[PDB]
């Protein structure tokens, strides 16, 4: 099964292996036990080149795992700025909501990736989006006393 091998190649950053597996019929949209696809794993582990290769070969930029995480949620959480920009350029839903009510903006705010926050804001991220406990990204910056983040969200 080339799908299980493609999943492993995307996580480990094996560029030549991804190219080989796809040429041999590997499912670009294969999922693991929890619904993660090669694009989710490439975005999480910061393999920028694998993300672009997968997107030129029919990967669903808005695929969701069992917890509703899109590749954009995982890229915003981990702090991979180049990948966040590539995903938005390829149609990623900036305001996608996971099972916990979090959008990529909520995750970039919590983890303190301020550059990614500015990028999401510039691409239309909703400042009024509330999580399951009713908090917006602006509420998170007020509750944690993060003046740097509150300034950016007030722009």
């Amino acid at each position: 099964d080339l799908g299980k091998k493609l999943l492993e190649a995307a996580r480990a950053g094996q560029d030549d292996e991804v190219r080989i597996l796809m040429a041999n019929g590997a499912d670009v949209n294969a999922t693991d036990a929890s619904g993660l696809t090669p694009l989710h794993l490439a975005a999480t582990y910061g393999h920028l080149e694998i993300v672009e290769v997968l997107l030129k070969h029919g990967a669903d930029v808005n695929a969701i795992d069992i917890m509703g995480s899109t590749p954009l949620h995982l890229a915003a959480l981990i702090g991979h700025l180049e990948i966040v920009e590539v995903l938005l350029k390829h149609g990623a839903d900036v305001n996608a909501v996971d099972t916990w009510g979090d959008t990529p903006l909520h995750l970039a705010a919590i983890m303190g990736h301020l550059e990614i926050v500015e990028v999401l804001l510039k691409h239309g991220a909703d400042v009024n989006a509330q999580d399951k406990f009713g908090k917006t990204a602006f509420d998170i910056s007020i509750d944690n006393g993060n003046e740097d983040l509150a300034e950016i969200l007030q722009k």
Binding site: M67, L107, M111, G112, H113, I140, N144, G145, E147
Partner: protein, 426 residues
């Protein structure tokens, strides 16, 4: 109650640790070769608390230096006080821990743990009356956090009747944006709640905020942050190092500052705040209680002081200090618990630190510290919910239940602070 055995673990632990030895050696009249060049007999009165007397009347720090990464040892020796350390007190492994708490605590760190304990035993048996231990470390990495807590538990099993005190550096994405740091810090807090008697919470978030918003350094470095840390460590150890009317030790501070066993996380503070290479009693009292002078990123006016200890250093009227301390408790009364009578203690030391005519050091056990714990907790939960990088930990022998248990303990800790913040003396 005399000698303290100091241990410094990992990169942050060794860097903050080296600056501490350099600063307190200067205050005590000691040079990098180990000789006493001081002018006041008050500099040698309690010198044995941190220094061993050696042949030729040489003063050797009772410090043990530990790291899984070997390169750290070279940076310690190349500093100004680098050759003052005992060449036999350096226990350095071959392979680091790459920000992995499990590497520090279970596999690479556990191999080098019996070696550190041999050095601890040697320094402890050579002590007339061992007070306890002092550990410097970060909670965000792998060695200082993972191996540091393992060392603490091991020492705790061998020397149960001694005090364990730590200077624990908390992570902030503002200084280091390494997404595994909330995991490492949460796992370590889970160990610190159980195994230490007193912990000084030194927050990199607060350190960055002071340098950027108050000191106007738009690009703060480790040197800049460590300048605030060394002044804090100098201030909080003043009474262990200088005679004074009080004969202060680690156990007397514990009995008086810690009303409930788990609530032993202190919020230190310093005034005046100054930058590298660059005041009256009423102003110094005010500054010492201002949220912008705290070393933990928490507003004290959001919580309540359970206990406070304050050290004013330099020449000044003790009556004026007594007057101003009582005055700050009158107007700011709603920020002190009324069920712990006389919970603010003050000491005056004649010897001030380097470059300052007067200074004040604040040590607060405040319910506002829950803000620091909630910040790390929210980050741990954001990561843990997506099981991001979990295999890097479980592959080293860790069970996923240890994460669940650490998160559960730290949230229980926040609930306990809230409980005493809302308690009334009725």
């Amino acid at each position: 109650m005399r000698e303290i055995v100091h241990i410094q673990a990992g990169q942050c632990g060794n860097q903050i640790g080296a600056k501490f030895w350099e600063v307190i050696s200067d205050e005590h009249g000691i040079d990098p070769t180990g000789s006493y060049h001081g002018d006041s007999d008050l500099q040698l009165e309690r010198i044995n608390v941190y220094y061993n007397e050696a042949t030729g009347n040489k003063y050797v720090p009772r410090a043990i230096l530990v790291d899984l990464e070997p390169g750290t040892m070279d940076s310690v020796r190349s500093g100004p006080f680098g050759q003052i350390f005992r060449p036999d007190n350096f226990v350095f492994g071959q392979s680091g821990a790459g920000n992995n708490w499990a590497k520090g605590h279970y596999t690479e760190g556990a191999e080098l743990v019996d070696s550190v304990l041999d050095v601890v035993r040697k320094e402890s048996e050579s002590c007339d009356c061992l007070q306890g231990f002092q550990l410097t470390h970060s909670l965000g990495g792998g060695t200082g956090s993972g191996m540091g807590t393992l060392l603490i538990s091991k020492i705790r099993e061998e020397y149960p009747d001694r005090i364990m005190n730590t200077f624990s550096v908390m992570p902030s994405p503002k200084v280091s944006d390494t997404v595994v740091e909330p995991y490492n810090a949460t796992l370590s807090v889970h160990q610190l709640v159980e195994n230490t008697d007193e912990t000084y919470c030194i927050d990199n978030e607060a350190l960055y905020d002071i340098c950027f918003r108050t000191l106007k350094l738009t690009t703060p470095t480790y040197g800049d942050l460590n300048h605030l840390v060394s002044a804090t460590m100098s201030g909080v150890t003043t009474c262990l190092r200088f005679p004074g009317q009080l004969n202060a030790d680690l156990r007397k501070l514990a009995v008086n500052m810690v009303p409930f066993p788990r609530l032993h996380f202190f919020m230190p503070g310093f005034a005046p705040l100054t930058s590298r290479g660059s005041l009256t009693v009423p102003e110094l009292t005010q500054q010492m209680f201002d949220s912008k002078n705290m070393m933990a990123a928490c507003d004290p006016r959001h919580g309540r002081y359970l206990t406070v200890a304050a050290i004013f250093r330099g020449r000044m009227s003790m009556k004026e200090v007594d007057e101003q301390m009582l005055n700050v408790q009158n107007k700011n009364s709603s920020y002190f618990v009324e069920w712990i009578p006389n919970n603010v203690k003050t000491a005056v030391c004649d010897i001030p630190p380097r470059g300052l005519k007067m200074s004040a050091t604040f040590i607060g056990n405040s319910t506002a510290i829950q803000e620091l714990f909630k910040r790390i907790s929210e980050q741990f939960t954001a990561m843990f919910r997506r099981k991001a990088f979990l295999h890097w930990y479980t592959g080293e022998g860790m069970d996923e239940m240890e994460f669940t248990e650490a998160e559960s303990n730290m949230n229980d800790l926040v609930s306990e602070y809230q409980q005493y913040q809302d308690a009334t003396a009725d």
